[PDB]
Structures are given as C-alpha cells and as structure tokens.
Design a protein around this ligand. Structure first.
Ligand SMILES: O=C(O)Cc1c[nH]c2ccccc12
Ligand SMILES: O=C(O)Cc1c[nH]c2ccccc12
Lengths: 377, 377
C-alpha cells in the first residue's frame, strides 16, 4: 500500500523540512548564532510547546479516554520501573542515574510533536486522541516521577557531600525560597543546629546512612512543588485538563477571542518545535554524541525494548487489533525531548538523551515504518 | 453595530496578545535576552515573514486583481513622490532622507501582518484579497524603489566623501562582489585610474558635481540587483507570483507534501511576527523614540495624510462604496516594518520609523475604528 506510505510521508516530512531548514541555517548557511539559537529554543520551550500541549489536552475530552490503552501504557512503565528497581537494588553495577536514563529511553517517546501527526496519518484521528491521552498522562504523572527521581538524586548528592558522617540524625529540612531547584548549577550551603531534645535540624540556602523516609519525603515534596510551580508544561497540562473537564461536562466552548489569542501562538507549535530541534542538532558538535556502542544500546532500547515491553503489557492487558498496533508503534516513536531536558539540567547522561532524541528523530521513519508493515502482516 | 466592533476585536486582539506577551517576556518577566530577542527577530524576518508573504501571494490569482484599486494605490504613491520631489528640489530645507522617510510614513502601511486580518474582519474576504494585492505590489515595486533611493543616497555619500573635486569625470564603476550593499556599516575604499583617452575609472572595494546619469544608473542598478538577490522577501514575492501565475493559468495545485512543508513554517507567521514586534517594543528604551513633537508629526502624517492622499487619489480614480472605504482604512493602517528595516540598515531616521511602527500599532485600533465608523455614516 504505497499510498499509505505516501500519506505518512506527507504528514511527517514537513517536520523534517523544518528540522533540516534549521540545521542548514546553523551549519550550511550559518543564519543563526549559538545564542540566537538558544533564544529560539527558549521561546519554543516556554511558549510554543506549552501552548501546543494546552491545545491538544484541551481539545480532547478526558471522559472518553480509552482506559485500556492508558492501562497498557502505565503497565509498560510499571514493568520498566520494577525491572529497574530490582536491577539497581540487586546488582553491583546497579545505579540510579542509569535507572532514570533507561526509563526515559525505554518508556518516554516523543508523543506530542511527532507522535500525534505520525499516528494520525498512520491509523486515524482516534489514534491522535490516544496519543494526546498518552501526552497528558506522561506530562502529569511520568515527568513528575522524573522530577521526583532527579530531586532525590540531587538531595542525596548534597547529603553525601555535606553531612555524610551523621546524616541519620537529621529530622527536618528548611530550604529558603531562593533555592529554586537542586539541579547543582548553584552551590548550596548547609547549616546544622542541635535542638533541645538532642535532635538535629538542617537549613540549606544559596551561596553512609539514610535519614528517615519522612524527612527525605518532605524535602523532595517541597522541592518538587517549587519546580512544578515554575514549569510551563505543568501549568499548560493542568489548565488544559481543568478546561477540558469544564468544557466537556458543561459543553462550554471557549470564547473565540481567547481561542484565537491562544491559537496565534499555538499554531507556531509544530514548526517552531521542529525548527528548534534542528537548531539543537546543528549546535551539537556530534550527531552520535554518546559514542557508537552506547548510542547503539540506546537506539536498541528505544526501538526494541520500548515496543517489546509495550507489546507484552498490551497483550497482558488485552489490547487487540488496531489498538495494539497503535500502542506498539507509539512505543516505537523517537525518544521524547522533555526527558532530555531534565537530563540536561540535571547533567545525568545528557549526551545519551541528546543522541536518542535527534538520531532517533532522523531514523524514526525507517524503524516506525518497518514496525507498521510488520504489524500489518 | 457593536457586534462588528467585537468581530474586529476578535480578529485583531490576538495579535496584541502575542505582542504584549513578548513585551512582558522582555520587560516584566525578562524571559529573553536582547541577543536572544535578536535571534527571534532574525528568524522572523528570514523565515516567518517571507513564508507568510509567499503564502498570501500564492493563494490569490493575479488575473483577478482589481485594477482600479491598484491604480488608486499607485496614484497615492505617485502623488506623494511628486510632492516630495518638488519639495526637495524647490526648498531650502528640502532633503532626500526626509523625502524617503515621509514617503514611508505616508504611503507604506503594515498591510501583511495586521492589514489583511484587520481588513478581512472589517469588510470581508475580498478585502483580504485586495490587501494581498497591495502587499505584492508594495514588495515588488515600492520596496524596490526604496532600495533604489537608499542605494542612491549611499552612493552619493561615498562620492562626496571620496572624490568631491572631480566626481564629474567618472565614467564607470566596478564594485567587487564582496561589497554586498552601500549601507555604510563597512568602510569602502576607492581607487581612481586615468584611462588612455583621458577618462577616469573608479573601483570600490571593502577595506559638488554629479557624474553622468548613465554612470550612477549603472552603479545603482548593479548594487540594487546585489541586494535583491539576497533579500528573503524578494524571493518570496517573486516565487509566489510565478507560482500563482502558473497555478491559476493551468489550475495546478501544489502537491500536498510541499504545501504542508511550507505551511508548517508559514503557520508561525502572524504569531511570530507579532511576538518579534513586541520584543522590539520592549528592547527599545523609548516608546516615543523620536521625540514628542516629531513623533506627533509622524503619527499625523501616517493617519491623516496617508488616508487623505489615498482618498483624493481614490475619488480621482473613481473608487466608490466599500472599495473606497477599504482603500482609505488600509491607508490608515499602522506604518509597515520593512520600510523601518531599510531605515535601520541605512540609518535614515530609524527612530522615526520605530515610533511609527510600534506606536501606531498600539494606537492603530482607535484611529482605524474611528475611520471605519466615520466612513460608515
Ligand atoms: O516530551 C516530549 O517530547 C513529548 C511530550 C509528552 N508530553 C509532553 C508535554 C509537554 C511537552 C512535551 C511532551
Ligand atoms: O512591510 C510590511 O510591514 C508590510 C508588507 C507589505 N509587503 C510585504 C512583503 C514582505 C514583508 C512585509 C510586507
């Protein structure tokens, strides 16, 4: 069915035209400076992607969500998390940063930018709705889980660097509001005060024992809240969900003035997202930025373990027909950007995630097609 | 008819939402650095505006152009040019830079970004087609005339600075291809060689008498060609005109793959144009950048002499009914950006054009409405 191939090409190749246009602008024609490219990327991440996410989340009703598809996706991610946990806590080389990066590679594809257009072209509008469900679920649950993991990593590094000898005695953390996140870019000073009852209180501000679960839970919860209240995508997804709920429970259409005020900048979503992705491709001196062997490992994870674990989860749940094919092909999408972002700010295998994103993007068509043809047999 | 007012507000206010969003991003929230803002602006000028112009020019057939409307616009501009010529050549204070800036203020509104949406909202789709006709005519003829004038200014300044005593003897100019334009940013060295027949030849490369009309014509023509072959809007308008001619003579629709490859970046046209305009508003330390008195003069010219000269030209030509109203209201639009751009690279009253553009943009609604209501009586 070469007509279906041409339809998929028509739907997907505009994104690559934009991406290659940006890549040539930075490499061939040198139209943009690195800081100008960074400015375009910042505009994208702050306005174009959050507004595109708001658009997609608001235009689908949460009450018609396919619960079985959601269960299949969450089961894939739960299987990945369980395997990673038992690998990290029962292995000599088991590690937390590797757990996070493997979770991102094997479970978090690019569902917003390329996923929705591609899957709509490949299967239909219902597939677009399913992809948007995956997008909302991912931005609300799994990116927040990534935030929890990254903040735990930062807190653990700070604890091991500040008070390793007697970290167990700490009972409460008080972080001044100036400390936005525990990324590690800024140095965080710590002071310890002994209480009347012999207890220890730690205060952290801007310049081998585990404390109780409650103390770390409090610290991570407050820090995660402080980073969520400053994440454009968090507000986008929340406000979109609330608006969708109210507008599909009471059938209330948004006023045309507000709808167009949002669309004027959301219409620049796909194009600017792909343009900034091309700018990033060009800026990076490498294309396989994490080494050939480990890059091959990351590609293999993304395009086999993602689809394979999604398949086992889907047949376990009971998905069949075009729904199972949509699930698997979605799992075979190129690795998402937001996990790469978090990896970059937290400097946790950022090269692996960059290679994932860009390389998979420009080899996502052959693999995704092969998947579609193979599943069609 | 407050419903018509609300429709105009719905059509126009999204642009101001984007513009104020950029203004706040640079001033209130300080999301963008000045160089990042410059990068966004450069992306706009190179991709979003040329692609938007290509879209608009290609989607209307040149064979259905309203010749009387075109004649009215060209008559307005011819009247302005004749008055400016007789003022500059028959007055003590008559000047060339003032001629160019007054022509830009009184004749070159923002017809692409705000003009088409506004006039479509106010009158209808045919008004959008008329505005696109004005856009194509302006980018092909009047911006090229601006280029001719600016290149003549630069050439005259170089002549007066290099060889004032015996400029009359020069017979031929030879500019090395490295010299892209005579803007004045780079210093241009000149060498004079006496020929066998007693003639003088000048060569200009990168570091009170008038020569014959032929020599200056040759120099200006070659320099204008060299700047046109590097203007994104020139290629946009040309290729759009050729495609429109071929696609409306043979009814040949563009392939969907190419159409979407172009649309993915042209869809970011209005939003990114207004976003960059807001970025420019914020970056400029002033809002009335050219002084209160001269800024008032520029606003008066823009919103009275433009509309008034357009009106006299339109009744002279024979426009009547909604066509005359569309002509006048279009003449009352805020001052265009491309003339401001040329003024900036040629450093010819750039503050006047900045004030024109931005100030008129955020006072274009009251004036344009007043015009619409007054013409409706
Ligand atoms: O991160 C991605 O690339 C895909 C994605 C899924 N949900 C999102 C929400 C906001 C921005 C991007 C995404
Ligand atoms: O310059 C303006 O702001 C309006 C306009 C008319 N014709 C144009 C062609 C390309 C870019 C802008 C314009």
């Amino acid at each position: 069915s070469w007509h279906d191939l041409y339809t998929v090409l028509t739907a997907v190749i505009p994104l690559y035209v934009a991406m290659i246009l940006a890549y040539g602008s930075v490499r061939w024609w040198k139209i943009f400076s690195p800081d100008q490219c960074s400015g375009i990327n910042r505009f994208v991440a702050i306005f174009a992607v959050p507004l595109l996410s708001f658009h997609f989340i608001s235009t689908n009703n949460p009450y018609a969500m396919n619960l079985r598809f959601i269960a299949a996706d969450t089961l894939q991610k739960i299987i990945m998390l369980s395997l990673l946990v038992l690998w990290a806590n029962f292995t000599r080389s088991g590690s937390l940063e590797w757990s996070i990066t493997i979770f991102s590679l094997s479970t978090l594809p690019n569902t917003l930018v390329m996923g929705i257009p591609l899957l709509i072209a490949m299967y239909g509008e219902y597939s677009g709705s399913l992809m948007v469900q995956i997008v909302v679920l991912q931005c609300i649950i799994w990116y927040t889980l990534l935030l929890f993991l990254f903040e735990f990593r930062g807190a653990k590094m700070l604890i091991m660097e500040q008070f390793p000898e007697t970290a167990a005695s700490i009972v409460s953390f008080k972080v001044e509001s100036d400390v936005v996140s525990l990324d590690g870019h800024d140095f965080l000073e710590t002071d310890a005060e002994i209480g009347d009852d012999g207890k220890l209180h730690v205060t952290v501000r801007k310049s081998k024992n585990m404390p109780p679960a409650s103390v770390m839970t409090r610290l991570i919860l407050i820090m995660v809240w402080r980073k969520l209240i400053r994440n454009p995508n968090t507000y986008s997804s929340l406000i979109g969900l609330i608006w969708a709920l109210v507008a599909f429970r009471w059938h209330v259409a948004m006023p045309k003035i507000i709808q167009q005020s949002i669309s004027i900048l959301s219409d620049a979503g796909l194009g600017m997202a792909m343009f900034s992705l091309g700018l990033f491709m060009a800026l990076q001196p490498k294309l396989i930025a994490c080494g050939n062997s480990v890059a091959t490992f990351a590609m293999a994870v993304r395009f086999l373990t993602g689809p394979a674990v999604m398949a086992v989860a889907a047949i376990a749940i009971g998905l069949r027909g075009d729904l199972l094919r949509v699930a698997i092909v979605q799992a075979a999408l190129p690795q998402g950007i937001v996990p790469f972002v978090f990896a970059k700010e937290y400097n946790v295998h950022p090269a692996i995630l960059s290679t994932g994103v860009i390389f998979g993007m420009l080899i996502a068509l052959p693999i995704t097609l092969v998947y579609y043809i193979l599943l069609g047999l």
